Amino acid sequence: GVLYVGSKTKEGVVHGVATVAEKTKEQVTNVGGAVVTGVTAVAQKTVEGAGSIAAATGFVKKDQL
């Protein structure tokens, strides 16, 4: 007996990201690491699993077992 007349739904949504860079100097030297200087939009609905990285930006993982 359910009805959907014109309904909307947003689950795990990235919407409307605006970015402007004008005349920006930028100098990076990197040795064995992560350097992030840009736009990163991640939209997910379901992430299941033990010990799992669902969204990583600028990540360094060096584990011993």
| Distance of closest approach, residue 65 Cβ to a second copy, in angstroms | 5
Tokens of 3: 């009805």
| Contact mark string toward a second copy, 23..52, x via CB under 8 A | xxxxxxxxxxxxxxxxxxxxxxxxxxxxxx
Known binding residue 15? Answer is yes
44 CB-near residues (< 8 Å, 6+ apart): 12, 54, 55
The number of angstroms, rounded, from the C-alpha of 31 to the middle of its chain's C-alpha atoms is: 23
| Distance of closest approach, residue 21 Cβ to a second copy, in angstroms | 5
The binding site consists of: 15
Q: For binding to a second copy (CB under 8 A), which residues are involved?
A: 1-65
